[PDB]
């Protein structure tokens, strides 16, 4: 959960 | 095309460059030391895939819980398939090109259990050169693999999803036509390539229960990185009850 969800949901 | 976009071009340039395994071969090779290194490599590739996924035109528009359900179901499919492509384009042997700083040769191939598993992998690389699958065809297929497996009761954004999937199916069709143009066997090939895709479910099934075995079996020396460990610990449940829908191009 935690780790994966963070990674995508962002916006480089 | 240029005017607006091809998805296969917009893909070929989001396509991750190889990562270096960071392997030290100044020391003898061993079953454990390799698998563990690959897992470590795998963790980094998957992070290099999480980006790719969001940078896939259409992907970032699904339900959050969907976009990660997809990556969680198909990370193995992505890794295994891209494995073939590297082996294919880089080398030619019944070897495997995990990284430029790590290639399983017929020497490493002959390690304890190294080949038991390197088997199913080698396969995917066979087809890609057999069907002379092209970078343009491969890139569309790889996207379709990301969109190949969904929750047993469909995603939350099923509609939008089904719409995206079909787009890349047509893009795959475009690739087949845009190769040479000898239409004669184009539909033939489309049948084949989507047959390949359907069979990736098999190779994943096998690669995954060995991933799960090495992850549960604490006698072996194999270690996993944090990233992979979380994904795996989450998947062992689902895969141990039945919540999974594997999409097929041919229900033959
Ligand atoms: C993603 C990965 C590493 C990086 C890569 O280019 C391709 C793959 C696909 C197959 C994966 C592999 C590693 O993680 C180690 C795995 C899981 C292997 C399948 C079985 C495996 O050898 C093990 O089960 C090790 O315990």
Among B212, B60, B61, B80, residue whose Cα is nearest residue B145:
B80
Q: Do the strands B102-104 and B96-99 form a parallel or antiparallel pair, or are they unpaired?
A: antiparallel
Give the other-Cβ count within 10 Å of B150's Cβ. 21
Q: What experimental approach yielded this model?
A: X-ray
Is B150 strand, coil or helix?
strand
b/e map B206-218, b = 16+ CB within 10 Å: bbbeebeebbeee
Number of residues that this document lists for chain A: 12
Spatial separation of the C-alpha atoms in residues B236 and B219, rounded to whole Å: 19
Among B177, B195, B165, B178, residue whose Cα is nearest residue B74:
B165
Please list, in sequence order, all residues whose beta carbon lies within 8 angstroms of the beta carbon of residue B233, skipping any fewer than 6 positions away: none
Spatial separation of the C-alpha atoms in residues B140 and B171, rounded to whole Å: 7
Cβ B150 vs Cβ B165: under 8 Å: no
Ligand 1 centroid to Cα of residue B21, in Å, is 12
Residues in chain B whose beta carbon is closer than 8 A to a beta carbon of chain A?
A: 47, 50-51, 53-54, 60, 64, 67-68, 71-72, 226-227, 230-231, 234
> What's the resolution in A?
2.5
* Structure-token pair, residue B103: 């290639």
Q: Do the strands B245-246 and B96-99 form a parallel or antiparallel pair, or are they unpaired?
A: unpaired
Sign of torsion, CA B218 B219 B223 B228? negative
Rounded to 10°, the helix B226-238/B31-54 angle is: 80
| CATH number for the domain that contains residue B9 | 1.10.565.10
Place of tokens 């998805």: B7
Judging contacts by C-beta atoms under 8 Å, the chain B residues touching residue A5 are 64, 68
Quickly list DSSP for B84-119: HHHHHHH--SSSEEEETTEEE-TTGGGSTTHHHHHH
Give the other-Cβ count within 10 Å of B125's Cβ. 26
First and final C-alpha spacing in chain B: 35
Tally the domains of chain B.
1
Please list, in sequence order, all residues whose beta carbon lies within 8 angstroms of the beta carbon of residue B14, skipping any fewer than 6 positions away: B52, B55, B56
* Structure-token pair, residue B243: 């919540």
Spatial separation of the C-alpha atoms in residues B74 and B142, rounded to whole Å: 10
Spatial separation of the C-alpha atoms in residues B151 and B36, rounded to whole Å: 30
Alpha helices in chain B (DSSP H): 7-12, 31-54, 64-90, 114-130, 135-146, 158-177, 186-216, 226-238
Greatest Cα pair distance in chain B: 58
Residue range(s) defining the domain that contains residue B16: 1-252
Spatial separation of the C-alpha atoms in residues B21 and B45, rounded to whole Å: 10
Whether residue A8 lies within 8 A of chain B, CB to CB, comes out as: yes
């Amino acid at each position: 959960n935690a780790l994966l969800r963070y990674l995508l949901d962002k916006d480089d | 095309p240029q005017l607006t976009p091809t998805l296969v071009s917009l893909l070929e340039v989001i396509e991750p460059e190889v990562l270096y395994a960071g392997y030290d071969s100044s020391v003898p090779d061993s079953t454990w030391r390799i698998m563990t290194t690959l897992n470590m490599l795998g963790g980094r590739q998957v992070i290099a895939a999480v980006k790719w996924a969001k940078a896939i035109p259409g992907f970032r528009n699904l339900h959050l819980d969907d976009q990660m359900t997809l990556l969680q179901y198909s990370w193995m499919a992505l890794m295994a398939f891209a494995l073939g492509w590297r082996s294919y384009r880089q080398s030619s042997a019944n070897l495997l090109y995990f990284a430029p700083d790590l290639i399983i040769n017929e020497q490493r191939m002959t390690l304890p259990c190294m080949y038991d598993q390197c088997k199913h992998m080698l396969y995917v690389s066979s087809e890609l050169h057999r069907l002379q699958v092209s970078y343009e065809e491969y890139l569309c297929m790889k996207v379709l693999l990301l969109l190949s497996t969904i929750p047993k009761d469909g995603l939350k954004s099923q509609a939008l999803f089904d719409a995206i999937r079909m787009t890349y199916i047509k893009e795959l069709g475009k690739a087949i036509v845009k190769r040479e143009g000898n239409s004669s066997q184009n539909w033939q090939r489309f049948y084949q390539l989507t047959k390949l895709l359907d069979s990736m479910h098999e190779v994943v099934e096998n690669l995954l229960n060995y991933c799960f075995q090495t992850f549960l079996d604490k006698t072996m020396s194999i270690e996993f990185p944090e990233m992979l460990a979380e994904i795996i610990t989450n998947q062992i449940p689902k895969y141990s009850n039945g919540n999974i829908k594997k999409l097929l191009f041919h229900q033959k």
